[PDB]
């Protein structure tokens, strides 16, 4: 210290030395990039942080943004690993940074945008700890925090009291901060590669798409998510209907549009969270209440329309999915599903499960989903019905938006690289039926298998080391390999790679036939009925 002291455009920062394997790294945690959105500043745009004097304690993570916490199994890591580990508060706008030792000069910078369907998440999660990527890949790992729920996305377009995309603005404000302050940490702002999972990847994609938020980075990684996902965006008319119902549920009396926001700004943060899910219009799964709204400024149209027309940042993209995307979401609503049983659902249950997966669908569209996912030779097989729902939910919400993104991106000669994480853990906490579930590639990307306190196989250490290299090499080169073999993806050649405890193998089609149903035909059907 030495390396534990950093002076930036906004103030001075006190670090922390952290040992990693045979060496160590430096960490700076709880660095604000904005002012606290409290009282009358709640639901507003993020105000940039007022510079401080003198040195700020950046030795501890700060609390996560107020959110709905998953209390389904309080004594289970499978659910608990995703919950806030250092508390919750409205004052939550902080970024965390991991720097190699000795401090580099112009090293690559990876910025993590966490998932949680815009209603949850924390940069402080153990699964997003940057220690291993920083030490093994000699890379700078930054993790930002962004408001979630009504607090981050209460949509009232036009109104300044709730501009609608407040959460993606918080993300933007952090990206703006990284540019103006990462070189004193030993990084290169010319090599800022943004990356995220689920809503995090939707956010990443919403940064490749929006206007004053595409110069803020060089490259992108979208893990198990896309901005054009059905759960990712909302109609300004719906976001308004949602905001008003929140008021009515909380016993508000309002005439004006800003008369609403005033009433909500008074209600306790838990009072609001406890009513947040009652706004959803249908009995559904993978549908989140307060999410990004197409306003007219941040979103000049829909991400679908934007990706189609090409209104975006043309740059290198690494994309991919897990073997079982849907399985996590099934156990949060669908009849007959549990992690505590085989979830051998009846034909009756399968049908109601389809209706909950395509909730905005009319009877003819539901019939189409049932046609593709039914074995017309073996209709009453409870194992096929379970596998079929896991596929509907995975395809509709995750894999198919990703393939449309990947096709629309190569519809510009952009080098797009696609993976499939399909190695299932030797020590996974979920039942066999759930396969390789949503979010379980992250621990491999972040180097967790290298930790001897975590009980992983030496074969799992190898794959983590490899994925860390691929992620780093892409952030460096724009090609996740080194010549002495991972190919590009186009709408024409939809090749992808298998990430597992086996040598990189190549596969030709990343669900092209089925995603043609979801992306080409299913919308067309609704435009005709």
């Amino acid at each position: 210290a030495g390396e534990l002291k950093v002076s930036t455009q906004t103030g001075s920062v006190r670090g922390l030395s952290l040992p990693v394997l045979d060496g160590h790294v430096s960490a700076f945690l709880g660095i604000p990039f904005a002012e606290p959105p409290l009282g009358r500043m709640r639901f507003l745009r993020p105000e940039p942080v007022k510079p401080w004097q003198h040195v700020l304690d950046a030795t501890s993570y700060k609390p996560a943004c107020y959110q709905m916490v998953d209390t389904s199994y309080p004594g289970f890591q499978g659910t608990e690993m995703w919950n806030p580990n250092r508390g919750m508060s409205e004052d939550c706008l902080y970024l965390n940074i991991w720097v190699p030792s000795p401090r580099p000069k112009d090293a690559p910078v990876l910025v993590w945008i966490y998932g949680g369907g815009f209603y949850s998440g924390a940069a402080s999660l153990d699964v997003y700890d940057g220690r291993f990527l920083t030490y093994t890949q000699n890379v700078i790992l930054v993790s930002l925090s962004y408001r979630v729920g009504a607090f981050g996305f209460l949509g009232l377009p036009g109104s300044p009291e709730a501009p609608g995309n407040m959460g993606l603005l918080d993300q933007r404000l952090a990206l703006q901060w990284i540019q103006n302050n990462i070189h004193p940490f030993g990084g290169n702002p010319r090599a800022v590669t943004v990356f995220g999972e689920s809503a995090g990847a939707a956010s990443v994609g919403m940064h490749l798409l929006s206007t004053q938020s595409r110069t803020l980075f060089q490259r992108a990684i979208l893990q198990s998510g896309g901005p054009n996902a059905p759960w990712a965006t909302v109609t300004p008319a719906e976001s308004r209907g949602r905001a008003a119902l929140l008021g009515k549920q909380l016993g508000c009396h309002f005439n004006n549009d800003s008369e609403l926001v005033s009433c909500l700004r008074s209600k306790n943060p838990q009072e609001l969270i406890d009513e947040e899910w009652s706004v959803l219009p249908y009995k559904s799964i993978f549908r989140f209440p307060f999410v990004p709204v197409i306003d007219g400024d941040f979103f000049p149209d829909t991400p679908e329309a934007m990706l189609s027309s090409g209104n975006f940042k043309e740059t290198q993209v690494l994309l991919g999915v897990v073997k079982d995307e849907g399985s996590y979401f099934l156990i949060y609503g669908l009849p007959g599903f549990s992690k505590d049983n085989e979830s051998l659902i009846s034909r009756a249950d399968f049908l109601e499960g389809v209706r909950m997966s395509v909730p905005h669908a009319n009877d003819i569209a539901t019939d189409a989903v049932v046609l593709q996912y039914t074995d017309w030779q073996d209709q009453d097989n409870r194992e096929k019905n379970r596998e079929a729902l896991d596929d509907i939910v995975g395809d509709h919400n995750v894999i198919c938006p990703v393939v449309q993104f990947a096709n629309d991106y190569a519809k510009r000669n952009s080098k797009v690289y696609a993976y499939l994480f399909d190695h299932r853990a030797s020590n996974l906490l979920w039942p066999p039926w759930m396969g390789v579930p949503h979010g379980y590639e992250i621990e491999f990307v972040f180097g967790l298998p290298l930790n001897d306190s975590l009980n992983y196989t030496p074969q799992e250490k190898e794959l983590s080391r490899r994925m860390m290299r691929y992620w780093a090499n892409f952030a460096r080169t724009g090609n996740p390999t080194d010549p002495a073999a991972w190919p590009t993806y186009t709408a024409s050649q939809p090749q992808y790679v298998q990430l597992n405890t086996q040598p990189l193998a190549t596969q030709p089609s990343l669900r092209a036939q089925i995603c043609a149903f979801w992306n080409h035909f299913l919308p067309k059907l609704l435009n005709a009925t």
Partner: antibody
Amino acid sequence: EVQLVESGGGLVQPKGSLKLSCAASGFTFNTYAMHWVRQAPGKGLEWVARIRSKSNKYATHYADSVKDRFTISRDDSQTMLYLQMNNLKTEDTAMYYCVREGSYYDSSYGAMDYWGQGTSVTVSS
Amino acid sequence: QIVLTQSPAIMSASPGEKVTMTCSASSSVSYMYWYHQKPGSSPKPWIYRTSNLASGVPARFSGSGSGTSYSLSVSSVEAEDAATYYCQQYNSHPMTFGGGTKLEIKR
């Protein structure tokens, strides 16, 4: 001070019915997950059922030996927990505790941090 | 049905002795919870999430464990510690409890 007061217990003939009540006080009942736990004489503890908050859509989960015979319910306005027990069996003879689970907000997160004194249930002819 | 096996069923220790109770799970669990039970009283929370002592529990008590193997220790046992200690898991449904350990203090 946190208090849990069970009532409704007693002697019921086999195949019979009984409804247990629980008077809760000293905490924001509606924000808590409540449970019913039983203890046969001289034996250990057996979980009966859970009921989550209104936010967690009053989601009920049952012990298999009880699924579809017992029903766990709430009335947050009266701060009351209930256990409707139908088709009672000699095996159900036990002390029934009305228990509170510690919220994310408490140090006791997930634990049965408060148990009532119990209500004795005897299933006999 | 995750089966929790407490051993010994009955434990006897002189005042001031270090004592360790174990809880063995049929399948690996993320955390273990402990409660104590005295005669004519309902159980009381004792340890939260493997190692965090409950409000009012003396410092001489400690918890620990991982995967399938969990334990509760008393550094220096006192007469006050005569009770039955049960372990609980809240990893999978149904939440289950061990058979318990009757801690008896010699005199």
